[PDB]
UniProtKB/Swiss-Prot annotation, chain A:
UniProt main location, coarse: nucleus
Full-protein positions shown: 26 to 113 of 134
Protein name, as recorded: Prefoldin subunit 4
Quaternary structure annotation from Swiss-Prot or TrEMBL: Heterohexamer of two PFD-alpha type and four PFD-beta type subunits. Interacts with URI1; the interaction is phosphorylation-dependent and occurs in a growth-dependent manner.
Task of the protein: Binds specifically to cytosolic chaperonin (c-CPN) and transfers target proteins to it. Binds to nascent polypeptide chain and promotes folding in an environment in which there are many competing pathways for nonnative proteins.
Swiss-Prot record, chain C:
Parent-protein start and end of this portion: 13 to 114 of 129
GO biological process: chaperone-mediated protein complex assembly; chaperone-mediated protein folding; negative regulation of amyloid fibril formation; protein folding; protein stabilization
Family membership: Belongs to the prefoldin subunit beta family.
Encoding gene per record: PFDN6
Cross-link (Glycyl lysine isopeptide (Lys-Gly) (interchain with G-Cter in SUMO2)): K54
Protein's UniProt name: Prefoldin subunit 6
Curated annotation (Swiss-Prot), chain D:
Phosphothreonine carried by residues: T47
Signal peptide bounds: none
Cross-link (Glycyl lysine isopeptide (Lys-Gly) (interchain with G-Cter in SUMO2)): K34
This protein's name: T-complex protein 1 subunit beta
Organism listed in the record: Homo sapiens (Human)
Protein family according to the UniProt entry: Belongs to the TCP-1 chaperonin family.
Subcellular location(s) of the protein: Cytoplasm
Residues of the full protein shown: 215 to 321 of 535
Residues with PTM Phosphoserine: S46
From Swiss-Prot, chain E:
Quaternary assembly: Heterohexamer of two PFD-alpha type and four PFD-beta type subunits. Binds to the C-terminal part of VHL.
Family: Belongs to the prefoldin subunit alpha family.
GO MF, one example: amyloid-beta binding
Full protein stretch here: 54 to 169 of 197
Residues bearing the modification N6-acetyllysine: K6
Gene: VBP1
GO cellular component annotations of the record: cytoplasm; cytosol; intracellular membrane-bounded organelle; nucleus; prefoldin complex
Localisation: Cytoplasm; Nucleus
Protein name: Prefoldin subunit 3
């Protein structure tokens, strides 16, 4: 069954949008490292909460989000490539 | 004469039904703002700082006292900030609701007036 | 009819985005227009995702202005596709009619 | 006119003042983003091999001069487009490469 | 014959299930990791100024002590509160195990429905 398109197109588009979101998260990290890099007050959000305390503590979830995105998304990129190769 | 008009009346009916779905969209868009107005009264009643049980995404509840009315916040645009101040949290988000309701009038008045011709087309279709 | 349908699809997918951007723009216009004069009660920052950074009004104005220019250019693109569709509607539709006629 | 003449415009970047050129035929230009660099070989992969050729190709800029110099160079002739930085590098090296030519005349 | 129409109807009425299920999946995820990542450590450590939802459009500043109390609702009438360790234990099944059946009843169901 030539089911590849129905199983790879959505994965490709969602991997693309997740890569764009990771790139934008990296941009946000860079921005907080130069724009409003004030130590004293910085609203930073973990899920549904701001804490305007983290300046260097921001990386504690910046790296978390970075890896939890990139590792999962390139693993699933390998998964969609596997879906491609199993048919061809 | 009549047969071709009756045949194209099906397409006329389908576009009218699309615009009727649009006005049903109109009835379903007021919600967010109407419970915003309903939630107005919470702001002034809790301006000393008060314990709240609030949803986290939709399905979670966690106790927590609200404070800092001087930076109550609304999201807008591509990621811009609306830091509502204290006096605003008491009284001035009433006018903010007035302007959101103004957009709500862009929805109901300014679209029902042009759907008057939709209902006129319904009445004319009898001919 | 191939070309007419292709241009219709182009019209549709351009106009959907144009209409959604109009729907968001009708709100952002006002929000920003009082925001530019109500300073103190609200102050401009960027909520670029789950973080906040102090932001200045001018780059937001440039952003919304280039939104406006982009969407106007897209409107002329869509309307050019509209003339393309109406032009094909004669001959690309007579393609089948002339072969059925003779 | 005598000799072999090209109808392009080369000017000064590859100088018109050179002697005893090493005439070659080379069908790959700098616009071809050719993979054969000192760096990694050709791969089809995006997990960790997205654009390493863009970093590798910076070696070609200097290799296109130094390899021929090691073989022995007084000039060089190339029949394909060359990117700017190698263009002034050849200008400083003394190489007369032509942007395009009638490729049927390679013989 | 009717094969095409019934095939399309099944595809539509199962794609709606796909959309709905991966509609509730993201927020239950959020319920898990938001708490387990931020609160479970920092709130259990010390009280901080916070942001909580006043509505889905009104967002209000807040502060929380080490309350460590959480509440779950599945309907408009039945409530139960929990600690900050067993609550995620009961929530984590509702997605980690739920995805395996619901999505297999989606991916494998699509694989069968391409022939069913």
């Amino acid at each position: 069954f030539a089911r590849n398109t129905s199983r790879i197109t959505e994965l490709k588009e969602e991997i693309e949008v997740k890569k764009k979101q990771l790139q934008n998260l990296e941009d946000a990290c860079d921005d907080i490292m130069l724009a409003d890099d004030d130590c004293l007050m910085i609203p930073y959000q973990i899920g549904d909460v701001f804490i305007s305390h983290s300046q260097e503590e921001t990386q504690e979830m910046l790296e978390e989000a970075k890896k939890n995105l990139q590792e999962e998304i390139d693993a699933l990129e390998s998964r969609v490539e596997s879906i491609q190769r199993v048919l061809a | 004469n009549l047969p071709q008009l009756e045949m194209l009346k099906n397409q006329l009916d389908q576009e009218v039904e699309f615009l009727s779905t649009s006005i049903a969209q109109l009835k379903v868009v007021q919600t967010k703002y109407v419970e915003a107005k309903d939630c107005l009264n919470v702001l002034n009643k809790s301006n000393e700082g008060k314990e709240l049980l609030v949803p986290l995404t939709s399905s979670m509840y966690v106790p927590g006292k609200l404070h800092d009315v001087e930076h109550v916040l609304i999201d807008v645009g591509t990621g811009y900030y609306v830091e509502k101040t204290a006096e605003d949290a008491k009284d001035f988000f009433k006018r903010k609701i007035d302007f959101l309701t103004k957009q709500m009038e862009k929805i109901q008045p300014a679209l029902q007036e042009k759907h008057a011709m939709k209902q006129a087309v319904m009445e004319m279709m009898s001919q | 009819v191939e070309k007419y349908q292709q241009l219709q699809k182009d019209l549709s997918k351009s106009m959907s985005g144009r209409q959604k951007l109009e729907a968001q723009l009708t709100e952002n216009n006002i929000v920003k227009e009082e925001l530019a004069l109500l300073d103190g009660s609200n102050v401009v920052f960027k909520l670029l995702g789950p973080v906040l950074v102090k932001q200045e009004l001018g780059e937001a104005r440039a952003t919304v202005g280039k939104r406006l220019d982009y969407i106007t250019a897209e409107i002329k693109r869509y309307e050019s596709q509209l003339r393309d569709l109406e032009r094909q509607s004669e001959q690309q539709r007579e393609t089948l009619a002339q072969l059925q006629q003779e | 006119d005598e000799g072999f003449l090209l109808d392009k415009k080369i000017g000064v970047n590859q100088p018109k003042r050179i002697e005893n050129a090493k005439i070659l035929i080379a069908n790959t230009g700098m616009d071809t983003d050719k993979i054969k660099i000192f760096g990694s070989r050709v791969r089809v992969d995006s997990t960790a091999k997205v654009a390493e050729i863009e970093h590798a190709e910076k070696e070609k800029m200097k290799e296109k001069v130094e390899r021929i110099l090691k073989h022995g160079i007084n000039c060089f002739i190339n029949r394909q487009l060359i990117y700017n930085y190698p263009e002034q590098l050849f200008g400083a090296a003394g190489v007369m490469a032509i942007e395009h030519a009638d490729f049927a005349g390679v013989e | 014959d009717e094969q095409y129409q019934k095939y399309k109807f099944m595809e539509l009425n199962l794609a709606q299930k796909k959309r709905r299920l991966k509609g509730q999946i993201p927020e239950i995820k959020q319920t898990l990791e938001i708490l387990k990542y931020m609160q479970k450590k920092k709130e259990s450590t010390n009280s901080m100024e916070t942001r909580f939802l006043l509505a889905d459009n009104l967002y209000c500043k807040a502060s929380v002590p080490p309350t460590d109390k959480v509440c779950l609702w599945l309907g408009a009438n039945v409530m139960l509160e929990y600690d900050i360790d067993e609550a995620q234990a009961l929530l984590e099944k509702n997605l980690s195990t739920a995805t395996k059946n619901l999505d297999s009843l989606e991916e494998d169901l699509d694989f069968l429905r391409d022939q069913f």
